[PDB]
Every structure is written in C-alpha cells, then in structure tokens.
C-alpha cells in the first residue's frame, strides 16, 4: 500500500495510491485531492521513490529506475538549477533558458579535464572529456549523439562541447568561433519554419573537431546528410521553405530585387502553398518595403520570434558571408541561383504531349537568364526528354520523346531540388574552407538531426524521419547494451546475459530488399497504373502478420478509425505507434531528373553554376544516405546527450511535466530504461550505501571503510546471490531489489541486530585478511622493483 506514480495530463505523472484492482487497470486515489479516483492501465503505473525530496546525479542510484522516477528526479534537480543528470553514461540536459553562473567558466573547464564520469557533478564537459580520453587512449574517433526538439538547447550544447575541446586540448586556434560565425549561413540554406518550430534544422549535421597523433586540435569539418528536398518545392500550411528565400525577399536592396526579379513570396509556387509571412517585430516591419509583403502578411501581421527576423537575419547572413571570405560577387552568385530556382517554379504547362503556358513566358525568361540557360533549350528540356531506341546492348538511336503535363512539372521540380541541394553542398564546403587541415588521426563529432515525431496526419516526410530515428535508436540500444555488459565484467559481476528485444524487425519492415515498404513503393512506380491504394494493400498483404504493422482501424485513437486499410498503415516504432496516411506516397517517392535537362544545367553559361555540378527513388536515396551516416557512427565510440525543452514559452523555472515526458519517450530514453531492466539497473557506490545505512549499525561497523561496511552488511543479511551482486566499486541490483534491501534495513531492527552480531567472527577475519594480504602485496611490489 505504498505510493505510486500514475498518469496526469499536464505533469505527466502524479503521486497516488492503489485502492482497487481491475483486469488490465488499477484504480488510483490521488494524494492531492483524495476522492477524484480514476482508472489507469497497469503498465502506466510505476513505483515511486519514498523520499520525494531526494535527488541523485545518476538515475541508476534510484531504487526504481523507470520513466516516472526519472521524470521526477530531473524535476527536483531542475528546481535547484541542476540541468544535467546521468543515466549511467547518458547525459540528460534540460535547457534553463537563462545563463547559469560559473558552470561554464574557464575554471570549471579545467576542473573536468582528465576526470572520470562519476567523480564530478553531471555536465556536458564530462561527456566531451570522456570522448577525448577514449579517442586518445583507444586510438578511436568519437561521436556525441544529441537528441531533442528544435530549440531544446542543442545549439548551445554543441557550442559547449566545441568550446570545451578547443580551450582544453587545442593550441590557440579558435575553431569553435569560426563555426559559430558560419552558422547564420548554414541555417539560411538548411533551416526552415515547421508547424512546431520557427527555426528547424532540416538536415543531419555532424560537426567534427579533428586531432593529430598528439591528440591536439588541428581543424574542423561539417559533414552534412539528408537535406529535406521536398520542402524546396512545396510546404504545408504553417510551414515555409528554407529561410534563405524569405531573407532574400524581405532584405535585398531594390537594386538586387530588380536584378533577380523578386517580389512578395505569394508570387512564387515554391513559397505560396505554405506560410508566406515574414518573421518581424514592430521596428523591423518598418524596414521591409511594402512590395515585399504578401496579402496574408498585410492582413494577419508578421510571425513572432524572440530571435528570428528575416530582414535582420538577411543582414546578419551577408555579414557571415564576409567573415568566411565570400566577396560581393560570390554572394550575388548565391542569390542569383536562389532566384533562378524561384522563377523555375512558376513555369506551368498545358495539354498540347505538353507545352509551356503563354502566361509562363516571363518566368522562363527570368529563370533562363539567372541560371545561364538559353530560353529555348530550357523550354525543350522541360517538355521533352531523350531516350535510346534500345535497352539491352544492341546498337541504338537517340529519339525525342515528349512529356505529358505531369511529367513536365516533375522535371521542373527535379531540376529545382538538384540545383538547390548542390547549392547547399557548396555552402557547406565553403564553411569547411574556414578551418581546413591536410591531415588528422581522429575526430570528435557532435550529431544533430531531427528526432522522432508524430502529428494527427503523418505523410512520407514523417515516415522518412521516423525511419531515420528507428535506425539511430537501434544504434543507441546496441551501444548501451555493450557499455552495460562491459561495466558488469569490469566490476566482476560474472556471467550475465541481458534480455534484449531488438527492433531489427521494424527496420526490416521498412527497408528490407524486395519485401520492405520502400521497395514495394518502388515497385508501385513500375505498374501500368500506380496507385497509393495498391501500394498500401501490397504492404498489408506481404506483411499480414508482422508484429509492427497494423491497419489504421486497429488504432487506439478515435480519429484514425474511418481510414480504410488501403489509405494507411500503422508502424509500431521504438517510441510508439504511428499511423501514416499513404496518400501521395507514390509521387513523393519520385524526384528523378531526366538526363537532357541535367546535362543542360551542367553546361550553364554561368561558371558558378557549372561548378555546383562538378533512376533511384526518394525512399532508396534516403536509405542510402542514412546508411552512410550510420557507417560513420558505427566506426566511432559513441556517447549520448538528451536535450530537453522544459516548456513551449522559452521561460525559465517552469518545468512542464507531460511535455518533458513526451520528449523522454520520443528521444528513446524510455526504450533504453526498458533495456536496462534486463541487466542491473540500480547501483550504488559503497560510499553512498555507507552514508544511507550506517546510522542503523553499531559504532563498531560504522567505523569500517565503506567497502568492508557493505561487505559485512551484505554477508550478515544473507542476500540472494541472483538479485544482489557485490562489484568492485558498487553494489548492483536486479529490478526492485534495492527497494527490497532498503525494507530489510528498515522493517525489523531486532532481526537486523541479531544478524549483525552473528557476522562478528567473519568480519574480524576479513579485517585481518584485508591488512594481511595488503602487506603481502606491498612486499611483492618491492620484489618487482627488485627485477
């Protein structure tokens, strides 16, 4: 009849008591109301730490390690401004939204150098230093894999790692300051407003500090992956294309506006299906000319953000270009390509196969001028493609094949995605030229990529992101599994397999060859009449009894109920079931650029464009690039940081429980807690156990060193050798067993006193033997010096 955590809509969990039981449910009486009893599913009720004011630096010190006790432990620590907490070697980091004094000072930096994780308070610096020490000693490059929502403190977190590593282990070159100066450039081309986040990174970013043989910093390198190409051409409402487009439209001089033929964003297909409004405040709104503002901007006003501002960010972006060496010519070259892409998107077509509409004539002219193409060549390559008359070896002829209207749209957009992506590659390579190096032995890299996410409606974009994260979560789990097994061997716990339920089957469901969802989607393209519904039935037919696939009717939510079996599927991901509506999956799986048109852009009049450039589906290109990311991570040692956004209002000292619970789930932390339940999830140093329980022992035992105190106590109590493991530095416990040990220390003092009296012989022996074998050890060390 002890306290438990039970669900609460805004705090995540609340403390309560179990007053009745049910078939799959428990009846909970909250402490904080007493008679608004409610039902909770059994797997949503968790045991609670007795001491509600206790906080621990490592959550493994808890007697029950579960998502509710983790949530509460980090709440209590957040209230005392301790934003950092471990789960073993994993770092949880809650954004304070204010500048914490002293924890990032040069003196603190110094105090973390060389120190083991566990001998200092939790900190991003301890993660950086662990990466450093393993790199130096094991001769192995390192990864630091950060999860979290956009704006969850990840940007700041990366800065702390780079600053720590350069100031501690570098020689005067301020590499981390050069990456920060480049940032406004990267964000302009690679970030965008989403439904939930004004400044969301739409690419996987891996920032490397490179080291020589002497483990000293030599340079930097930004690896980039998986830029989200679909955003370039279309966006949902409440979302925008990449920031660059809006910064250019709002901030460019009238002179550049006329040279690139820009106008308000509502005039461009590639902007005007999404949100066409600027981030501005009262002052910056006055600096944007009226001819840059869309009808919806003039009507509903500007978008609001405490940092983002398109006019101001334009200036700041041009300043960042100057600092990375970009002259005014290369800057206008970038803008010219951007405007080229915008005008490209306004070209329409009509059933003649097809033809440029007459209204689209000036878009063509402007696009062609800006991308350095002949108007006529462009017109033809958009409406026609070449083809060989044969396929399998025999001598063939070139023929001209006209495109239908929908195929012309596709080539137009394909060309846009290719130009924009190549421009992005150029921008990143340009950043990397600000801190180059000829050679390196190893690197420490920090990864930032969009996390697992779901909405009411989930399309192909979500499917890809959640697939990316399913694979990253398997990587997270493999490495924690390995770290734990190694900890247990290192500590002398003996033979211990930990029960691991792999998520390989979900991964196979998505990506396996021929039978995976992606290959079945590819197969749909090949049929005479490709259909989203045929693709979806084929998935359900081939994986009829797959553990991780269900039809939409089986959903636990209401709103998915009327979705037909052929309109969607559910996937049981690591973080939870997601229902995907499959409408448009087939078209979103295609963005190939046919060859005459690609060859055309490669031989643009303009040299900058030619330099940018010098039959696979979107799904499989995604898989391929994802696998290169994983190849890189798999070749390194891995450490993990979980950044948490405490609320949606950027306010300090406001812990929003359910929002944080949600992020703990989506970031894979809960899945890792389940995994650790198969091992020894609770552990405590002899020093912690000594301080907790010495008050219950005779002064005799209270005078022992912590390790012998614990040995005596554990022997005295006659503890079951399966559940309790006496390691080198800590006592390890199977699930629930630290709580059970605690009850023995509290429930029957007369029993405990007799058991202690009876261990007196064994203890006096162990205390002789200890010192005896220690003098014998000091003798053998003298003899080895004598060799």
């Amino acid at each position: 009849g002890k306290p438990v955590w039970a669900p609460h809509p805004t705090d995540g969990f609340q403390v309560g008591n179990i007053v009745d039981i049910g078939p799959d449910s428990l009846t909970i009486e909250p402490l904080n109301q007493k008679g608004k009893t409610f039902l909770a599913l059994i797997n949503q009720v968790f045991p609670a730490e007795e001491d509600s004011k206790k906080d621990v630096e490592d959550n493994c010190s808890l007697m029950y390690l579960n998502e509710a006790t983790l949530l509460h432990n980090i709440k209590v620590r957040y209230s005392k401004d301790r934003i950092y907490t471990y789960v073993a070697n994993i770092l949880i980091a809650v954004n304070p939204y204010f500048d914490i004094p002293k924890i990032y000072s040069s003196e603190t930096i110094k105090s973390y150098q060389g120190k083991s994780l566990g001998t200092m308070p939790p900190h991003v610096f301890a993660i950086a230093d662990k990466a450093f020490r393993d790199m130096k000693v094991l001769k192995l490059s390192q990864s630091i894999i950060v999860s979290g929502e956009s704006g969850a403190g990840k940007t700041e977190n990366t800065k702390f790692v780079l600053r720590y590593l350069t100031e501690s282990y570098g020689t005067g070159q301020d590499i981390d300051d050069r990456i920060v100066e480049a940032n406004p450039l990267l964000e302009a081309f690679g970030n965008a407003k989403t439904v939930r986040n004004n400044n969301s990174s739409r690419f996987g970013k891996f920032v490397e500090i490179h080291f020589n043989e002497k483990s000293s910093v030599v340079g930097g390198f930004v690896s980039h992956y998986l830029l989200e190409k679909s955003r370039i051409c279309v966006q949902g409402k409440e979302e925008r294309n990449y920031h660059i487009f809006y910064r250019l439209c709002a901030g460019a001089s009238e002179d550049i506006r006329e040279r690139l033929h820009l106008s308000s964003p509502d005039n461009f297909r590639y902007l005007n299906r999404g949100c066409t409004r600027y981030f501005a405040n009262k002052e910056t709104d006055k600096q944007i000319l009226q001819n840059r503002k869309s009808p919806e901007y003039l009507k509903a006003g500007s978008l609001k953000d405490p940092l983002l501002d398109d006019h101001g960010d334009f200036i700041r972006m041009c300043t960042a270009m100057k600092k990375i060496g970009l002259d005014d010519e290369e800057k206008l070259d970038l803008f010219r390509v951007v405007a080229g892409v915008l005008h490209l998107g306004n070209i329409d077509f009509e059933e003649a196969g097809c033809n440029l509409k007459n209204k689209s004539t000036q878009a063509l002219e402007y696009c062609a001028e800006l991308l350095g193409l002949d108007q006529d060549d462009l017109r033809v390559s958009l409406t026609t493609r070449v083809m060989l008359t044969t396929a399998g070896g025999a001598k063939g002829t070139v023929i001209k094949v006209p495109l239908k209207v929908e195929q012309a749209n596709n080539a137009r957009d394909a060309l846009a995605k290719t130009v924009y992506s190549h421009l992005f590659d150029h921008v990143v390579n340009r950043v990397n030229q600000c801190f180059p190096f000829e050679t390196s032995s190893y690197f420490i890299g920090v990864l930032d990529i969009a996390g697992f996410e779901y909405f009411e409606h989930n399309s192909f974009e979500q499917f890809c992101i959640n697939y990316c994260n399913e694979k990253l979560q398997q990587f997270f789990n493999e490495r924690i599994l390995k770290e734990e097994q190694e900890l247990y061997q290192k500590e002398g716990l003996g033979v211990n397999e930990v029960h691991y339920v792999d998520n390989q089957d979900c991964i196979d469901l998505i990506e396996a060859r021929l039978v995976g969802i992606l290959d079945i989607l590819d197969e749909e393209n090949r049929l005479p009449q490709p259909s989203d519904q045929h693709f979806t039935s084929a998935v359900h037919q081939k994986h009829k009894d797959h553990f991780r696939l269900s039809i939409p009717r089986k959903s636990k939510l209401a709103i998915h109920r009327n979705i037909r079996d052929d309109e969607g599927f559910i996937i049981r991901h690591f973080a939870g079931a997601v229902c995907y509506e499959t409408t448009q999956f087939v078209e979103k799986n295609n963005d190939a650029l046919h060859m005459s048109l690609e060859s055309l852009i490669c031989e643009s009049r303009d040299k900058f464009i030619r330099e940018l450039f010098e039959f696979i589906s979107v799904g499989n290109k995604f898989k391929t690039q994802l696998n290169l990311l994983l190849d890189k991570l798999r070749s390194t040692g891995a450490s993990f940081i979980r950044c948490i956004k405490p609320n949606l209002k950027m306010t300090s000292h406001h812990f929003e429980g359910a929002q944080i619970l949600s992020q703990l789930q989506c970031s894979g932390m809960v899945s890792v807690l389940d995994l650790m339940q198969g091992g020894f999830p609770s552990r405590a140093s002899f020093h912690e156990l000594y301080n907790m329980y010495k008050k219950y022992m005779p002064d005799k035992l209270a005078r022992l060193d912590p390790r012998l105190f614990c040995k005596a106590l554990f022997k005295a109590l006659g503890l079951n050798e399966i559940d309790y493991k006496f390691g080198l530095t800590k006592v390890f416990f199977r699930p629930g067993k630290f709580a059970e040990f605690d009850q023995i220390m509290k429930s029957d003092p007369d029993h405990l006193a007799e058991l202690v009296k009876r261990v007196n012989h064994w203890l006096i022996c162990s205390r002789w033997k200890k010192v005896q074998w220690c003098s014998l050890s000091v003798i053998k060390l003298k003899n080895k010096i004598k060799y």
Partner: protein
C-alpha cells in the same frame, strides 16, 4: 596462475590501495600504502613498474593489472611489518600502529578484540603461525 580464493583476497587488498573507491590505483595512492608500511620506493620506480603492466595504457592500474603486477619469506617479511621490535609477536599497540598507518579507524577495545580472536593460545599477542591460519580461511 592464482586460485579463486587468492584472487578474492587480493581484491580486498586492492581496496586498501584504492581509498577513493573509483576502482583504480593511481601512482600517488600506490606510494601512500607502501610508504605507510615502511618502504621507500621512488617516483621513477613506481611509474616504470606501472607502465610495464598498464595494458590498456590509461596511466592507471585496474584490478586485473594489479594481479599481474604482484616464497614463504614474503609471508614472513609480511609478518615483520607488524613486528616493529621483532620479538616474533604482535601486540595490541603494534597492530594499532600498522592499522592507523594504513588508514583504519578504531578504538583500543576494537584492536584488543581483533588480537584475541586470532590469538589461539591466549598470551595476549599474535605469533607467526597463528598469523598464517587467518590468511588461509
């Protein structure tokens, strides 16, 4: 090379070296215990003895490494560290000297009790043969 019994016994010895309890002996710590038990090895003899066994190369000695780093004359010279004046016998005042040099905290009641449980013949002190019998249980 070593029996199960003796590996366990050296594990308890190891914690005597490893005071902070971090599962590892530094150079500083290794010196503290040898010098406290009447020895004068030097900063280069320690460091060079450590480097010849530091397999993982992390500047530090874990328990496995301590084992390799490690002949009744050793046992007899072990006894002679407790036997300051060397009458072949360890008193309560002499055990108290090695205990407190080692870092062990106790009152003389406690010291006297230890000496009694090991003292088989009842003369108030601990001879060499009774010293070995403990080690081996």
């Amino acid at each position: 090379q070593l029996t199960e019994e003796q590996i366990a016994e050296f594990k308890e010895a190891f914690s005597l070296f490893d005071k902070d309890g971090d599962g590892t002996i530094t150079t500083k710590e290794l010196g503290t215990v040898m010098r406290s038990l009447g020895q004068n090895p030097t900063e280069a003899e320690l460091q060079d003895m450590i480097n010849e066994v530091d397999a993982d190369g992390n500047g530090t000695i874990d328990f496995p490494e301590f084992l390799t780093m490690m002949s009744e004359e050793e046992i007899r010279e072990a006894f002679r560290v407790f036997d300051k004046d060397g009458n072949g016998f360890i008193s309560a005042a002499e055990l108290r000297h090695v205990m407190t040099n080692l870092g062990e905290k106790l009152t003389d009641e406690e010291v006297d009790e230890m000496i009694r449980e090991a003292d088989i013949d009842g003369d108030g002190q601990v001879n060499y043969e009774e010293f070995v019998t403990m080690m081996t249980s």
